[PDB]
Amino acid sequence: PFETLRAAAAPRYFGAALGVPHLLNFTHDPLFDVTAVLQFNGATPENEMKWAYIEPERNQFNFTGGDIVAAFSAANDYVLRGHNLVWYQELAPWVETLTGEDLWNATVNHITTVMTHYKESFNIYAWDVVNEAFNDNGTYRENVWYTQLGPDYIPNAYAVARSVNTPSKLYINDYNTEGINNKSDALLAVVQSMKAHNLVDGVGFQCHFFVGELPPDLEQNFARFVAAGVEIAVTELDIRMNLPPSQADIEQQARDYATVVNACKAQGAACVGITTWGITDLYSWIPSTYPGEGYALLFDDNYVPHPAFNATIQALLA
Ligand SMILES: *[C@@H]1O[C@H](CO)[C@@H](O[C@@H]2O[C@H](CO)[C@@H](O[C@@H]3O[C@H](CO[C@H]4O[C@H](CO[C@H]5O[C@H](CO)[C@@H](O)[C@H](O)[C@@H]5O[C@H]5O[C@H](CO)[C@@H](O)[C@H](O)[C@@H]5O)[C@@H](O)[C@H](O[C@H]5O[C@H](CO)[C@@H](O)[C@H](O)[C@@H]5O[C@H]5O[C@H](CO)[C@@H](O)[C@H](O)[C@@H]5O)[C@@H]4O)[C@@H](O)[C@H](O[C@H]4O[C@H](CO)[C@@H](O)[C@H](O)[C@@H]4O)[C@@H]3O)[C@H](O)[C@H]2NC(C)=O)[C@H](O)[C@H]1NC(C)=O
Ligand SMILES: *[C@@H]1O[C@H](CO)[C@@H](O[C@@H]2O[C@H](CO)[C@@H](O[C@@H]3O[C@H](CO[C@H]4O[C@H](CO[C@H]5O[C@H](CO)[C@@H](O)[C@H](O)[C@@H]5O)[C@@H](O)[C@H](O[C@H]5O[C@H](CO)[C@@H](O)[C@H](O)[C@@H]5O)[C@@H]4O)[C@@H](O)[C@H](O[C@H]4O[C@H](CO)[C@@H](O)[C@H](O)[C@@H]4O[C@H]4O[C@H](CO)[C@@H](O)[C@H](O)[C@@H]4O)[C@@H]3O)[C@H](O)[C@H]2NC(C)=O)[C@H](O)[C@H]1NC(C)=O
Ligand SMILES: *[C@@H]1O[C@H](CO)[C@@H](O[C@@H]2O[C@H](CO)[C@@H](O[C@@H]3O[C@H](CO)[C@@H](O)[C@H](O[C@H]4O[C@H](CO)[C@@H](O)[C@H](O)[C@@H]4O)[C@@H]3O)[C@H](O)[C@H]2NC(C)=O)[C@H](O)[C@H]1NC(C)=O
Numbered sequence: 001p002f003e004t005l006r007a008a009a010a011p012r013y014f015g016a017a018l019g020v021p022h023l024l025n026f027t028h029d030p031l032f033d034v035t036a037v038l039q040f041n042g043a044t045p046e047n048e049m050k051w052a053y054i055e056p057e058r059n060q061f062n063f064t065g066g067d068i069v070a071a072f073s074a075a076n077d078y079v080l081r082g083h084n085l086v087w088y089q090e091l092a093p094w095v096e097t098l099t100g101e102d103l104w105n106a107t108v109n110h111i112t113t114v115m116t117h118y119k120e121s122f123n124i125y126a127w128d129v130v131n132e133a134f135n136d137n138g139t140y141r142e143n144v145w146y147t148q149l150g151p152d153y154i155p156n157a158y159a160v161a162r163s164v165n166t167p168s169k170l171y172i173n174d175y176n177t178e179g180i181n182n183k184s185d186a187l188l189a190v191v192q193s194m195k196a197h198n199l200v201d202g203v204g205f206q207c208h209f210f211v212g213e214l215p216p217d218l219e220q221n222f223a224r225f226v227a228a229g230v231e232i233a234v235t236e237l238d239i240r241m242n243l244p245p246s247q248a249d250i251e252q253q254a255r256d257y258a259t260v261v262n263a264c265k266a267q268g269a270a271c272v273g274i275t276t277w278g279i280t281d282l283y284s285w286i287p288s289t290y291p292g293e294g295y296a297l298l299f300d301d302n303y304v305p306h307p308a309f310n311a312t313i314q315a316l317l318a
């Protein structure tokens with residue numbers, strides 16, 4: 001109280017994507033784990049619970065990576081989000097050639113085995129069961145499950161997740177759904193249905209934003225999901241800019257983080273937390289995905305806070 005993100009956010013959590021290779025780099029880069037403990041009280045595994053890592057061959061599970069992030073989280077009594085179970089990317093190659101009932105059987109076994117493991121071992125607050133199931137124009141993404149099983153795979157996946165009987169909230173997660181547009185409309189219609197049918201609890205908004213270009217009706221869109229009766233969370237926040245960073249963009253980034261915080265706070269108890277997709281710019285996915293862009297997180301390459309850090313603290317407290 002009130003100098004850290006985690007303190008300022010209470011009773012909401014303020015989390016970070018944590019990668020196993022950075023956590024285990026404590027010797028050479030202690031500030032990563034130190035900043036995690038001092039500033040954050042939520043965590044999402046960056047990669048190692050994804051299908052390609054956790055079930056690399058059929059019915060052969062590898063929990064090592066997920067267990068490391070979960071244990072770090074448990075030691076610090078973080079809010080832990082499981083991420084993710086059904087997603088067209090970072091999918092083990094053997095899945096992509098399965099057809100029909102065979103594909104569905106593999107998927108049921110994936111969801112059930114992974115969730116049962118973490119039910120018995122750790123406290124998972126929420127699971128991103130299905131990730132990125134829609135296209136920008138509001139149609140269903142034609143991934144392998146859609147192609148083989150049709151649109152019903154989405155509620156069926158939540159049905160399977162429910163049958164594990166964990167105390168985890170079940171979330172659906174996506175990007176470009178943060179404003180009011182075709183994609184968020186489509187997501188909302190499906191969420192309204194699934195919520196009616198007791199299948200989903202939460203909606204995750206990734207919020208991979210570009211500085212000074214946030215969605216115009218961010219808060220209003222959050223509000224209509226909350227009106228549908230789900231909780232929401234900001235799940236993968238970063239706000240990127242062109243490098244080297246201009247003074248104007250650094251200042252605007254501060255305003256943009258505050259804008260996201262305020263859109264969350266406006267929902268009261270229904271918005272449970274904010275997670276940034278990483279801790280420091282030094283390991284951000286952005287400069288390797290968008291060359292010449294970066295400076296997107298709250299701490300720079302030397303773990304010195306951005307001006308956005310102060311703006312986030314102030315918005316959380318106010
Ligand atoms: C289930 O899921 C699991 C979890 O995901 C999977 O397990 C993970 O699998 C991945 C992929 O294979 C693996 O990542 C790779 O690891 C490679 C091994 O690196 C480690 O070991 C080497 C070698 O250590 C030996 O030698 C040193 C000294 O030379 C000694 O100190 C060691 O104790 C050890 O000695 C013993 O063995 C030798 C013979 O090997 C004997 O001669 C000796 O007598 C001893 O018996 C180390 O050098 C590495 O150390 C680095 O990282 C650790 C952190 O864990 C640091 O503490 C350490 O200081 C050092 O850090 C430096 O390197 C890192 C990058 O590695 C830098 O970031 C950092 O700045 C430092 O410079 C490890 O301990 C590794 O080689 C490989 O590297 C990749 O990147 C390089 C670029 O450098 C590329 O060129 C390569 O191609 C690779 O892509 C990569 O990181 C994970 O380690 C592994 N486990 C975990 C927990 O994630 C599992 O496979 C899966 N199972 C399935 C699917 O079945
Ligand atoms: C575990 O912890 C360790 C820390 O102990 C982590 O290692 C560090 O990892 C970071 C992130 O990858 C690296 O930062 C990057 O550095 C490169 C340049 O690196 C070269 O130059 C370094 C500086 O060299 C001078 O200065 C030193 C002393 O300061 C002198 O000793 C030298 O002689 C030079 O005068 C040098 O230190 C580097 O180290 C190399 O040394 C060993 C041998 O010792 C070599 O074998 C290795 O190859 C090792 O690299 C190296 O020579 C920068 O270019 C990077 O900046 C880009 O990326 C940033 C984000 O990552 C971004 O903010 C920047 O703006 C910039 O991005 C821009 O440019 C990109 C070009 O690629 C564009 O793609 C992009 O879009 C954008 O436009 C970055 O700063 C550290 O070098 C590294 N430190 C060490 C000591 O290794 C390690 O990663 C951790 N591991 C895990 C798993 O967490
Ligand atoms: C809204 O935008 C979406 C996304 O841009 C767009 O959806 C795309 O539609 C086209 C067809 O109009 C899909 O193209 C393919 O058509 C062939 C048949 O010729 C199918 O075999 C494809 O199936 C996929 O699966 C194959 C394995 O069996 C793979 O080879 C590959 O993954 C194929 O894509 C597929 O139906 C295209 O896949 C989709 N894209 C996505 C992301 O869903 C849609 O047309 C737009 N609607 C509008 C503008 O009204």
Ligand SMILES: *[C@@H]1O[C@H](CO)[C@@H](O)[C@H](O)[C@H]1NC(C)=O
Pocket residue numbers: 137138139182185186
């Ligand atoms: C998406 O926008 C287009 C305009 O190009 C519109 O015709 C269509 O009805 C919209 N889709 C949905 C699902 O609202």
Ligand SMILES: [Mg+2]
Pocket residue numbers: 073074077078123
């Ligand atoms: Mg706990």
